[PDB]
Amino acid sequence: VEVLEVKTGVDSITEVECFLTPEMGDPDEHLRGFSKSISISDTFESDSPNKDMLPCYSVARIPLPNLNILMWEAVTLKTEVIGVTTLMNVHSNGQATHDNGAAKPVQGTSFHFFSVGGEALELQGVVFNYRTTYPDGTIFPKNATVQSQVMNTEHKAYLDKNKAYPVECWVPDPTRNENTRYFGTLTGGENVPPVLHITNTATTVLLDEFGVGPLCKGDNLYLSAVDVCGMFTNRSGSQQWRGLSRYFKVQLRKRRVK
Amino acid sequence: VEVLEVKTGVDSITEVECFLTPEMGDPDEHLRGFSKSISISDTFESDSPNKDMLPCYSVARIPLPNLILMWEAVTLKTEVIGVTTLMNVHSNGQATHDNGAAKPVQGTSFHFFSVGGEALELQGVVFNYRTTYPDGTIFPKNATVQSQVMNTEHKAYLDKNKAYPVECWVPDPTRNENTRYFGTLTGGENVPPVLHITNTATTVLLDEFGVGPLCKGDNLYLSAVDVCGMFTNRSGSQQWRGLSRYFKVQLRKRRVK
Amino acid sequence: EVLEVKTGVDSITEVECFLTPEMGDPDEHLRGFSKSISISDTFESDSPNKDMLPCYSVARIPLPNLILMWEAVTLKTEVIGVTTLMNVHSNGQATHDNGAAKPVQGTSFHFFSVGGEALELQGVVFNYRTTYPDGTIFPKNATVQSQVMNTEHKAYLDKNKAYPVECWVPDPTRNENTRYFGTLTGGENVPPVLHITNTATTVLLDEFGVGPLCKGDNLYLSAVDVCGMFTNRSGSQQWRGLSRYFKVQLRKRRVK
Amino acid sequence: VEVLEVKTGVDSITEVECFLTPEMGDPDEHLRGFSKSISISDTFESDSPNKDMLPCYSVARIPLPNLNILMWEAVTLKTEVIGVTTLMNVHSNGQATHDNGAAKPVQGTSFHFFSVGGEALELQGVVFNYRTTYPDGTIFPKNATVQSQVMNTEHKAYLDKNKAYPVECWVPDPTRNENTRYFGTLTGGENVPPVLHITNTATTVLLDEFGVGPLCKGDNLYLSAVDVCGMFTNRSGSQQWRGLSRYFKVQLRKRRVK
Amino acid sequence: VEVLEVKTGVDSITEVECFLTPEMGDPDEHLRGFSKSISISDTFESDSPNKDMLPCYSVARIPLPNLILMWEAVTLKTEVIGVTTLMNVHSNGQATHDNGAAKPVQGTSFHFFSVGGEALELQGVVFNYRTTYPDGTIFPKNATVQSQVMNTEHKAYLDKNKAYPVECWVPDPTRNENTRYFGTLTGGENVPPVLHITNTATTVLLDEFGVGPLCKGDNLYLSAVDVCGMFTNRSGSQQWRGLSRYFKVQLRKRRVK
Ligand SMILES: CC(=O)N[C@H]1[C@H](O[C@@H]2[C@H](O[C@]3(C(=O)O)C[C@H](O)[C@@H](NC(C)=O)[C@H]([C@H](O)[C@H](O)CO)O3)[C@@H](O)[C@H](O[C@H]3[C@H](O)[C@@H](O)[C@H](O)O[C@@H]3CO)O[C@@H]2CO)O[C@H](CO)[C@H](O)[C@@H]1O[C@@H]1O[C@H](CO)[C@H](O)[C@H](O)[C@H]1O
Ligand SMILES: CC(=O)N[C@H]1[C@H](O[C@@H]2[C@H](O[C@]3(C(=O)O)C[C@H](O)[C@@H](NC(C)=O)[C@H]([C@H](O)[C@H](O)CO)O3)[C@@H](O)[C@H](O)O[C@@H]2CO)O[C@H](CO)[C@H](O)[C@@H]1O[C@@H]1O[C@H](CO)[C@H](O)[C@H](O)[C@H]1O
Ligand SMILES: CC(=O)N[C@H]1[C@H](O[C@@H]2[C@H](O[C@]3(C(=O)O)C[C@H](O)[C@@H](NC(C)=O)[C@H]([C@H](O)[C@H](O)CO)O3)[C@@H](O)[C@H](O)O[C@@H]2CO)O[C@H](CO)[C@H](O)[C@@H]1O[C@@H]1O[C@H](CO)[C@H](O)[C@H](O)[C@H]1O
Ligand SMILES: [K+]
Ligand SMILES: [K+]
Ligand SMILES: [K+]
Ligand SMILES: [K+]
Ligand SMILES: [K+]
Ligand SMILES: [K+]
Ligand SMILES: [K+]
Ligand SMILES: [K+]
Ligand SMILES: [K+]
Ligand SMILES: [K+]
């Protein structure tokens, strides 16, 4: 596509506003937003995580007003993690930090990630341990070899289904994704404190170095997210991932292309 | 509402200067600024916190000079009041080691403030949907398991002081177009408070179109939470500790149609 | 009414000085330290000794006699003696067997201000039943409301080694003729992070281009630099503070 | 070299996109991306690490389109660590952080480093311990003396081979490297949390203070990297370095020289 | 001097490139870059550190081309050399836990550098005025209890290498107008070193008037400290570990009156 002028006028702009719920595993009817308690395999060879123990990428495909050549161009993003103050519940079946103390709050490894694109997020598969057996009902790197622990170019995929692509074995493919803007931070360590900021005054500009945002193929906007905030420790010491929803507001304009 | 010109002239500006006290629970006549000591339920379904154990949002509705003109909030200076109180490490706390000073206030903090031309709009989200919030608090009603991530039924206005518990409400990012809000949750049992003070910092409240919050009915709404962390008693029991927040807001008269 | 700045060689002056810390100085050998910290047996019985309480430092500096008033325009400031915290061999508490001594660490408060009059203070107490000791100036008639905000507790930082750090802060409702800056970093294991350089200048002008205007040709400097606590071999702990350098540039301003 | 004007026209620019795999030691056929478990000598003098326990620098020499005097000038870099979310696998033969807890995640000492130049990265040898015996199959500071613990100007080398130059005994030589741009961070400490950021929106400009980027001698571009993320702790407590691959995208333009 | 114009043209600029080795104590023929193991006095009064246990400031005086014109230092690039040595966690250190790797170098650090047209000016400050500093070091003389906070008698020049202990001297902020200095003390026994390297970062040495350090007698003075932390031996004994610092300074000729 050769990119030409922006359309102007009342009709030329539109907005998407929505939220993506986290997909942490949801091990039972009371534990939406949590994973199953984490168990550790006896050996590398025997690593076989159950689906409800594996956080997955969230994705939404948002239909835009039909245009047809014009395409919707995503220009700005406001985004926020929803429910940050829930982590102040340190009185609910947790593990006391010391005798008579409050419960240990959610903490430890986090991944906060979001993207806005004009097509599905492109994924590259990378595994901690290539002998991990990923479970039925997930989509994972197939024919994994030892080289998959560092880089195996066979593992290419699209983030095209919710509750399906486990976080731990996929990343945005930096060799593609030219029509998407993605941003993420993995903060490791078992004791790391969550640090969650909220404001309605911050905008991210989605334009590239040529002044062009993601262009929405087939008039669909793709939003993706992961917000694994840390782990919740219950009184037994067992730990579960806890996630939160992410708010998106995207402003778009119509752009002519050839 | 179409927004038109700003008014000028000596008459056209005003300032609001005040403080909001923290609402940490205040379990007895001696414990203003603290919560009740925190206990832990044996199961999710038995989580039933006492009201005096729950920090709540602070809010103040400030009447402005009667005025279509509307007062437009343009700048904010804000500060946490009494930061140095956290240097009292001698008041029946828990020695960090034999012969040592008391463990200082630390752990989970939430520092939040907002300035708007109407009540802060809230979205309820719960850690655990089977938590029973107590009498005298206002809380997400008809909670379901979906309320643990997002249930759009839980909409409210921060319209009452010491009533909305911090842990089950956040600013609603889907609304709040006429408010500016800012907050940080810093988690962890051992996180050190880091509290900055200065009278030289100003936050501009104008949006991307140059328009600040417009005060409906000539009222300015200020909201805050400043849970600084937990105080650990000698016994090991822990209480939230909060501090007041100073606000100075400058406003100008704006014509609307 | 602030009018024009005077120019010419004669129109500027500089103040350069240091403020020593006032940590309690429990004996003739312990300048810069507090008395070891004890913990009350009950919350109600909190009663810290004077020599256990760090206090605000203040200096009033006379300026050249001058309507014109000296206007403070810039500040350079620095903590003096940051490397002393590398002494980990002076009867401290070994971090483990055969190890060096635990360094100074823990709760710190670093604060400085420059004004044309005394810093204005607001009293706030951690515990309203704390008995503050004879020889200190503290919030009088404290009530439970003093734990969060009691507007009765107003004061001027007008005396050195007197106003305890823990029960006073800069009053944000006043201080229009002062510029102040402070950070409390709390936690028993927090590391000191102390930067020094002679290349960084703070501008003291407000949003209208006006710096503090020095009433009576006096400049007021205040500081706190509680760096953390030193832990003795026995486990007892003392606050340790350090001196602060100030360099302030001033210019003559006409006022009506 | 006198540097003259930049060529223009559609023909005057090119891009290199690739990835460099980590070289952590690879102790067996299942442990690509890991080192051998780390052991400790019994005396300072007897330090003698095995080759498979020593992470090494990665390097790639990338042939560029033939010129000829024109040279390719490297102007911009996008780079990213690939597979950051692998660190979320805390269920694979690790050491529980407490009773019933999840596995301790990868953490501890990290070195993240990358460079782009018009010739091989120039190295200076520095050793923690001059009496360390570096193993056969590595290239290490020769004839080390006590002065080599701080600075011995004899130890000059070029990063010209993979799986050869151990990270711990070489650094970029700050006294040379004028035709290279390098960037690195050592974060030391056994419990340091990894903090890994990903985005496709960040570009580094490689131009120096005269507006000139690395000039590619012989039409070769040199990319180097190290991404030791931390250590993985096994059930028994033994620890292995864990590394990840690094993506590079470099934009180049033709520059006339005399 | 009145500072006049910069000279232009051929031979109006020059560069200095060098490195300064650390002076950590060097307790034997094998331990260049380390201190003697750190011992703790039995009483506060009896503090008496051995010379080889005390890191010292590094200094180099670099002769410039002979020139009134004076060489004016305009820019600096600097780097710590050998940052990756801290990845040696296999050399008779102390395992962090059963079967683990050795504890890496960590804890209290001081990273400092200056560039000036004359010797760095020092002010003495002591942690403990009853500390007996050892023969062969240059230290605050006639120390009194006031020396624990500020005693203006302790003035010195950093005019000798491996002589001025780091712990009892700092740059004198009341002087040093013809030097630019930068440092950071990071304290705590477990602080992680964070060491950045790049050849793309330049510091400009010009003051607010556009004037860099002017080199009296055509000599440039470079000073450094890079105590990276402590190495913990298998036995638990600890030694300071330091690294060399690279300097590249660009200078120009300046006429003065
Ligand atoms: C364990 C011990 O005796 N330490 C004392 C030390 O002895 C020297 C050797 O010990 C180490 C160490 O301190 O652990 C071994 C390390 O690998 C060395 N590390 C490096 C990087 O060199 C350090 C280091 O050289 C010094 O600490 C630097 O000052 O030394 C010890 O193994 C050796 O033992 C000899 C023994 O003397 C001899 O009779 C026997 O036949 O063979 C043994 C093995 O060769 O002796 C070394 C001294 O020659 O020496 C230092 C001197 O500074 C101290 O005396 C240290 O004692 C500890 O000091 C602590 C204070 O930091 C604390 O007070 C402890 O209570 C002391 O035990
Ligand atoms: C030790 C004890 O019995 N704690 C009770 C508490 O009894 C209080 C007094 O205890 C203390 C405390 O918790 O250690 C003493 C402390 O100095 C006080 N601190 C302040 C700043 O006031 C606190 C504080 O007032 C309360 O915790 C606020 O809720 O109280 C005790 O010494 C005295 O004999 O009796 C007093 C009567 O109340 O009462 C609390 C009422 O909420 C609790 O019942 C507390 O029980 C402990 O609670 C822990 C969880 O928070 C845990 O479950 C322990 O097992 C339980 O003993
Ligand atoms: C161990 C002891 O008896 N501590 C007393 C103290 O006695 C001091 C001397 O003790 C020390 C110390 O506290 O360890 C020794 C240390 O090297 C000194 N450090 C410095 C930098 O000078 C300190 C220091 O001078 C004081 O703590 C300052 O207040 O003192 C002791 O070795 C000597 O035999 O006698 C000395 C007194 O003449 O006196 C203190 C007076 O405040 C306390 O009474 C201290 O007792 C401890 O107090 C702690 C908090 O107050 C804590 O509660 C302990 O449980 C308690 O034993
Ligand atoms: K398997
Ligand atoms: K690409
Ligand atoms: K309940
Ligand atoms: K909205
Ligand atoms: K009392
Ligand atoms: K005021
Ligand atoms: K050896
Ligand atoms: K060079
Ligand atoms: K002595
Ligand atoms: K001076």
Side-chain angles (χ1 to χ4, degrees), chain E residues 211-230:
Chain E
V211 187
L214 296 169
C215 296
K216 294 170 178 180
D218 306 324
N219 289 304
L220 186 63
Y221 282 77
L222 308 173
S223 319
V225 184
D226 290 285
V227 176
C228 295
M230 296 179 188

Side-chain angles (χ1 to χ4, degrees), chain B residues 16-55:
Chain B
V16 166
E17 193 169 21
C18 69
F19 61 88
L20 274 54
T21 51
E23 300 297 340
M24 298 297 103
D26 301 345
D28 75 17
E29 75 207 83
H30 307 292
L31 288 174
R32 185 81 170 117
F34 296 80
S35 77
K36 196 190 214 281
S37 57
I38 299 156
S39 55
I40 306 160
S41 71
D42 288 337
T43 61
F44 271 21
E45 68 179 359
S46 63
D47 187 28
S48 282
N50 275 11
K51 181 178 147 94
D52 57 348
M53 202 187 78
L54 292 177

